[PDB]
């Protein structure tokens, strides 16, 4: 839903890397290497943030009030 | 015995091994640069200072690796997330 | 009849991880020490989380859940607090926690990130570690919604909750060329060379060492950043030289009362 | 700049002098005497005529400015100190070119006589730890005591960049690279005046560790501030003379032909002229150059080389009596520089059946790097014979390396059999069964008796 906030089969902190990892796709790295600049080595890190679905951008379509 | 040729010349072409050999470069023991500090009679530095492209890699020591993360694969893809706007 | 001696070299030492390498020492001794790195070195961590207003997408467990996996800056302070089960004071106090707050309500269309940057301290050396990069994501907030809460921290092991654990991930490799022949590769030319492979391009493992012993041993302490990554070593030798010294108190206690 | 205004007794500076000729350096004195002029226009008019590229000049009026150092110009002694300094740190810069007529202690005792009286005014200035500080390098030791008086300058006044630059010199010595290029990277961001080039000896650190990248861009923009520098035309001959493979031509021609053109008085270019033109088969010309590539040289590791050099010119001719003595140099100079030396000693002291000392010096040899063909020089001059595993275990070793790689091997195998038929006879014989095809490809020639003897028996 949000972005795990550490890897879970490792530890490193993954939740403050979303947006920049969008960010870096925005910039049009490639897939992989917005993970090498994140600074992302273990594969257990990677899937991290590969394998995230970030649903809450859709949860966040609903209004509770406005 | 054996009447072996004794080694009196070289049939070797050890030439191969004179070639490769690194010349280190010692034309004056300063270093080819006269140390002293009343011969700096001009400067560069007046104040259309030079700074050239090729002068500013040397000034880095070691700065300048792979990227088999990109290599195109056909059984290999990419990734789709949350937009707002979709079918 | 008695101790090796250790020894020590640090290969490489950043602000996120140690490598280095104890030499003699044993096997046992070394994945012991790696245990302790994981398990036992002592963090500050969110462990409290009282929740007053909470209007997130994400239910209150949610959030609390995240908030303990945010780390802390406890560098310092992890050694000064005492464990809050053994604190006397019938409620969290500085001497035993760190107070958190959290306010934030998106009165804005454009949605706001809740972040670590959002946790505020009772005490500016327990901070989230991105405060001192960008900073963790706890929510994403509309137009409208707020989450309000007050959290402490407290000590506590990464044997207890892995909140606690300190580090992102222990390296820990000896014989790196199969000397010992405790791992027996079907077919050893498939195996890619470990970073610290001593051997040249052309063989593929070291002669078998029958007499040899695991004797060096190639650590990598990565940080999650709640300590330095030497902060990491020393305390995890700290802890568990500890340990055996109560272990020891408690034995000396059984035989004498014998 | 090109005339100044002269101070005269009356009419001051309504007179000048001029320095496109050249004038007497005779009569200067005597004219600056008479006229009275200030100490300033002493080191004005001695600044123009090192401007003309004139050393000596500058060097011989500056010295009878010492006597008139305060007649009656009211206490200018820091333009005396000033002057003084001049003549306490050019004789150092001057003793290193010496001429043929002079020696290098003739201006020692001249560098080290007049630096005393300099700081008799000012001591420990910006300039006088300079002086202390090079004249260790000149004797060839004390290179801790010149660093430490190098240091000195940066906590008193360090107020130009050469006043950092001795210490990457001396750390150069001590085979420190790392050190020196730390303190030769200051050189180029400020980059003050010198027509030495000062990115030259930049260029020459980034040749160790692998730094071919920097160094070629080092001697190029040398190239292009002064193509009158042969230190980083050279250079690049050294890069390439070991391409010896392709576009030979621009290493003899844009690499060795301009350099020696340009500047043919230099020992390291007349050396590697005579090493590629040995390759060429041109002898005539090799030893010309070799005999005027030694006689200027002073540090060994060139004249070593320029011996290794006569003595390969005399080696192919058949001439081993003018070439032992030749390596013997080359070896007495400069024994650590290279393996070449050792080598050229090991393969002439066949001669004359003093191969006992062969051994001993091809010894050395293996200390560096082993190779196919030093493997063969003692496996022939092998004196082990019979239960002798001193000389034996060496041979083994030797025919272990060219066993593996196949160098033509025609008698390799035979030099095997030889040594195992003490050891198990089923390698000699293996070895005599591979030796006895290995004699038929070359030419149809039949299998000499004594090979056919020894496998029999
Ligand atoms: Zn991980
Ligand atoms: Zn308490």
């Known amino acids: 839903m949000i972005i795990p906030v550490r890897c879970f089969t490792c530890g490193k902190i993954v939740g403050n890397k979303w947006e920049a990892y969008l960010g870096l796709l925005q910039a049009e790295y490639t897939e992989g290497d917005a993970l090498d600049a994140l600074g992302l080595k273990r594969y257990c890190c990677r899937r991290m943030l590969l394998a995230h679905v970030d649903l809450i951008e859709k949860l966040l379509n609903y209004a509770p009030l406005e | 015995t054996y009447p072996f040729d004794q080694n009196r010349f070289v049939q070797y072409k050890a030439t191969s091994l004179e070639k490769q050999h690194k010349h280190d470069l010692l034309t004056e023991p300063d270093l080819g640069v006269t140390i002293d500090l009343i011969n700096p009679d001009t400067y560069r530095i007046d104040p259309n200072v030079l700074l050239d492209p090729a002068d500013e890699k040397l000034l880095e020591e070691e700065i300048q690796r792979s990227q088999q993360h990109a290599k195109v694969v056909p059984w290999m893809r990419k990734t789709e997330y949350i937009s707002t706007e979709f079918n | ?258 | 700049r090109g005339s100044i205004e002269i101070p005269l007794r009356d009419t001051d500076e309504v007179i000048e002098l001029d320095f496109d000729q050249l004038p007497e350096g005779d009569e200067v004195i005597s004219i600056l005497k008479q006229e009275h002029t200030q100490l300033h226009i002493w080191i004005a008019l001695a600044l123009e005529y090192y401007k003309q590229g004139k050393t000596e000049e500058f060097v011989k009026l500056l010295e009878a400015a010492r006597i008139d150092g305060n007649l009656d110009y009211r206490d200018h002694e820091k333009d005396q100190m000033t002057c003084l300094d001049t003549l306490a740190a050019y004789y150092v810069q001057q003793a290193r070119k010496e001429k043929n007529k002079d020696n290098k202690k003739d201006l020692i005792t001249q560098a080290t006589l007049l630096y005393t009286m300099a700081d008799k005014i000012i001591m420990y200035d910006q300039n006088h730890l300079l002086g202390r500080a090079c004249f260790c390098l000149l004797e060839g030791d004390k290179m801790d005591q010149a660093d430490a008086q190098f240091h000195f300058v940066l906590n008193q006044s360090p107020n130009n960049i050469p006043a950092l630059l001795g210490k990457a010199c001396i750390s150069f010595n001590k085979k420190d690279y790392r050190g020196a290029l730390a303190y030769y990277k200051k050189a180029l961001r400020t980059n003050p005046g010198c027509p030495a080039e000062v990115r030259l000896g930049m260029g020459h650190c980034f040749v160790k560790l692998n730094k071919l990248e920097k160094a070629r861009l080092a001697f190029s923009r040398a190239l292009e501030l002064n193509s009158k520098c042969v230190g980083a035309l050279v250079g690049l001959a050294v890069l390439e003379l070991n391409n010896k493979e392709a576009d030979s031509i621009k290493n003899g021609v844009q690499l060795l032909s301009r350099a020696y053109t340009i500047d043919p008085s230099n020992p390291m270019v007349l050396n590697h002229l005579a090493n590629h033109f040995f390759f060429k088969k041109d002898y005539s010309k090799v030893q010309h150059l070799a005999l005027h590539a030694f006689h200027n040289t002073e540090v060994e590791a060139m004249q070593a080389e320029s011996c290794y050099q006569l003595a390969r010119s005399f080696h192919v001719q058949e001439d081993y009596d003018q070439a032992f003595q030749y390596y013997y140099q080359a070896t007495q100079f400069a024994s650590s520089s290279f393996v070449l030396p050792f080598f050229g000693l090991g393969q002439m002291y066949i001669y004359r059946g003093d191969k006992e000392n062969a051994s001993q010096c091809f010894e050395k040899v293996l200390k560096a790097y082993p190779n196919n063909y030093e493997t063969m020089k003692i496996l022939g001059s092998l004196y082990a014979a019979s239960e002798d595993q001193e000389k034996r275990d060496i041979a083994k070793g030797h025919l272990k390396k060219v066993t593996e790689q196949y160098p033509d091997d025609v008698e390799a195998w035979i030099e095997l059999a030889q040594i195992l038929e003490q050891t198990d006879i089923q390698g000699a014989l293996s070895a005599y069964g591979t030796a006895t095809r290995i004699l038929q490809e070359k030419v149809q020639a039949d299998v000499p008796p004594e090979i056919l003897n020894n496998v029999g028996a």
């Open chain 3, 1 to 258: 009849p008695y101790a090796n001696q250790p020894t020590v070299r640090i290969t490489e030492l950043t602000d996120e991880n140690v490598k280095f390498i104890i030499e003699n020492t044993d096997l046992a001794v070394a994945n012991s020490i790696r245990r302790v790195f994981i398990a036992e070195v002592p963090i500050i961590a969110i462990d409290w989380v009282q929740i007053d207003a909470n209007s997130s997408v994400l239910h209150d467990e949610f959030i609390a859940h995240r908030l303990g996996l945010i780390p802390l800056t406890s560098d310092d302070i992890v050694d000064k607090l005492q464990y809050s089960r053994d604190c006397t004071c019938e409620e969290f106090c500085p001497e035993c926690s760190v107070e958190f707050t959290l306010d934030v309500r998106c009165n804005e269309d454009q949605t706001r990130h809740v972040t670590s940057r959002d946790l505020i301290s009772n005490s500016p050396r327990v901070i989230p570690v991105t405060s001192r990069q960008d900073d963790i994501l706890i929510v994403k907030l509309r137009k409208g919604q707020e989450l309000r809460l007050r959290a402490y921290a407290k000590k506590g092991f990464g044997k207890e909750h892995a909140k606690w654990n300190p580090t992102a991930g222990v390296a820990f490799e000896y014989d790196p060329d199969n000397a010992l022949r405790h791992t027996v590769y079907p077919k050893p030319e498939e195996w890619p060379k470990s970073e610290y492979s001593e051997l040249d391009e052309d063989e593929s493992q070291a002669p078998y060492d029958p007499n040899g012993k695991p004797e060096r041993f190639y650590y990598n302490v990565e940080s999650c950043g709640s300590l330095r990554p030497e902060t990491i070593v020393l305390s995890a030798l700290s802890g568990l030289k500890k340990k055996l010294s109560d272990l020891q108190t408690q034995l000396s206690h059984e035989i004498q009362s014998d």
